[PDB]
């Protein structure tokens, strides 16, 4: 089981000794520093508050456990037993910390305060940055939620242009990333961030996380349909791919089914097997139960265009009111190999140039996508901006000579609406002047309690695209 | 709590219906496919076996939980209740699976079988690839362990060249990556993979994982020492950086201490503050308690060289028996900003060109490093190679026309020593001919039990460098 005393960077065990004497407040903040990704979706903090930070997180056994680990880890007695004892005794092991944050799902320009952290008891001045390590991991859900929102913008633009509406937009990017991320916990967190934007997922761990920590309007927040994998095709033997296809589509005759078609030869599969041998089993399917053919290899754009071209020559094609080609309603395509933000855009643009509607296609996003995301992408950063020492508030910051991009904000911070309705972060306590109306940060955690919560519904609403609102 | 019935990709829920009728065995394998990283360290499977796969992992409540989720997730009844019931009743919820694997810590060339998975009961033919998703996540510890071994090779080469020995090699790359990875679980797994190669870490989660799932020779598998962070320097106020430095080194006068020195001006900090104002507090320190100065911004190579140059002009420098410059034993440097496999090599080479011993420096590795690692780097791949249908064994594989790199191995597999002592993977059951001696894969899991285990000690020994052995 989890011990918060063992869930920090080792050096932070030694920091209580290092602050200026008689420091009664350490106040820190998180932002996605400025200097493509101009706005970020704030999401994921609530998961961390609930799983790791709330309630009685300190016990005598956890204190003794950490004392023993750190004695061996540092080969010395540096662990602050007294400090944690104080928390245990005075607060019944609840953390004397207050966290204020912008609402989950909010879409905020870079370079704004997203949350602040401070101690509520002068003796716990050291606790603020002890928990930096765990809080800074919010970089991941923020970054995943942001990246998928950007992909949703691309899909919305092209779907609107080629079809005239946004029908089905929320099912156009399906999460395939479960196996390609680094852990079960990461799979759940990342999938939950995908689901802020979309409704189709195979990462079941995301469903469980959302139900436990956020809650949903509907029984589940995401959906899937039956589909083959290479093993269920190749198990039939090379010469029996047709038999596998027939078996599978028949077993799933009345619901949508997707069938990977590139095990041996995608082009032969589409033209000869689906297009001729089994064509009678396709054209008889309901609109509510299409076959969704999946290529999974080759150049993504070339293979999609070539598959569309083949199907278009074997199946009746219509031209929609925008002038774009549309497969019959019982037949669609999904591309789930090598799809990232760059290649997604390349494919939909290539489709548009060849006069194919984006209605025809869906995409699957893999795990490598998310693995390539780093805390550096949006410059997710946690810094101390204010301390009280000897009863005097002091505005503090770093400003390394060889990197002005690493300069940090100074003093007490607050987040506001501008007269033009944008966001602004006020430094040095200037929010107190009340020239910019109400601080948009809410207290979400205080003294062991989660004081403000968001349902997954509120988060999805906050994260909507403008084009979705228009 | 964790439900294995909900820990797969959604589509795999539907696969039991898709295999050829009367299939009694599905046998699959994992490899780091061929086609820089020519050999990989096999590590991490044991964590997964113990945490997720062993014992009674199926219960009636878990079956009903999954049934309810999947009914809503698919908007249909597709979940295989009967199959999981069978496991619960016949095997007391233990998984009828056998996994055979190369020993943990083994260093193996690409394109070899690393583990195999098969069902042990004909009714559970579908269970083999149900668990693909969870097993394939072994890509992460394998890849992290491999990447850190490659960095260790670079450090060993340059430390030997510039000092004549490998003293301290195992403390030259310290894990700083806790905050920059995607979750607590990932932090633990990745840190454990780092610790296969090194002994210095700040990712405390790695200690806990190793103690629980592998076990160590010593009380803990990794160590750290006290150190500042920017907040403990900047909290003093801009004009009092000197006061912060003095306070910190005095508080830690008798143990090693590292102090980040770039809050405002790294070059002034080294030349004027450490080099003049506080120089008397440095030259008085024990060899067992050096000050380790940390730059953390600017071009990594340039800043390291400039810091060395400055310290060399303010402190007595010796020339070792190899002809390289060496700071006094109470003074060292650590660079923990932007260090990856490329930049590490650039820095040690640049140091070598300026005649500085690698004894002078240590490195910190960040989280972005590990985030940039993907399952694609070593081409980690899980494929079905053999099925038994109608009592007949059939060798199966995929071979997509537009990507011969995605071709898979055929038939029953085994791993062997070659006459020249290298590794070879035999396909199509050819291992049974016994022309290549004993299969190197061991049964590590069978029917709910972990049948062979490795201590962290055996893994570290297996993963040693050749130069360490020589
Ligand atoms: O089909 C799969 N699921 C079912 C499915 C069927 C149809 C649609 S749809 O047309 O959007 C649609 C949605 C809807 F809600 C309703 C509808 F009617 C239709 C969506 C989903 C399916 C397929 C593949 C798959 N996977 C999970 C991992 N994978 C593979 O695993 C690998 C991932 O590894 P990397 O991370 O390295 O990339 C890669 O091979 C990757 O293809 C899942
Ligand atoms: O000093 C730090 N720990 C103590 C320490 C002191 C000395 C040595 S040594 O000279 O090897 C040594 C080892 C030994 F065993 C014994 C000895 F005697 C000496 C090692 C370790 C320390 C410092 C910084 C630090 N951190 C943890 C995260 N961070 C920062 O957090 C950020 C990471 O974010 P990204 O993932 O995006 O990169 C980045 O700013 C990164 O610098 C930890």
Numbering used by the authors:
A (entry chain A), B (entry chain A): 8 to 42, 53 to 487
Excerpt from the publication:
However, the part of NAMPT structure that is responsible for inhibitor binding is not affected by the S165 mutations. This prompted us to investigate whether the mutations had effects on the phosphoribosylated (pRib) adduct of the inhibitors, because it has been shown that the cellular potency of NAMPT inhibitors is dependent on the formation of a pRib adduct and the resulting inhibitory activity of the compound adduct. We determined the crystal structures of NAMPT-S165F in complex with GNE-617, a close analogue of GNE 618, and its adduct pRib-GNE-617. These structures revealed that the pRib-GNE-617 binding converted 380GRS back into a helical conformation. The rewound helix, however, adopted a different orientation compared to the wild-type structure and avoided the steric clashed between Leu386 and Phe165. The dramatic conformational changes induced by binding the pRib-adduct suggested a significant energetic barrier and decreased inhibitory activity.
NAMPT functions as a homo-dimeric enzyme that catalyzes the rate limiting step in the primary salvage pathway for NAD synthesis, the transfer of a phosphoribosyl residue from 5-phosphoribosyl-1-pyrophosphate (PRPP) to nicotinamide (NAM) to produce nicotinamide mononucleotide (NMN). Crystal structures of NAMPT in numerous ligand-bound forms have been reported. These structures consistently display a NAMPT homo-dimer with two essentially identical active sites at the dimer interface. Typical NAMPT inhibitors were found to occupy the portion of active site responsible for NAM binding and a tunnel-shaped cavity extending from the NAM binding site. Furthermore, we determine the crystal structures of six NAMPT mutants in the apo form and in complex with various inhibitors and present a definitive model to explain the differential effects of the mutations on various structural classes of NAMPT inhibitors.
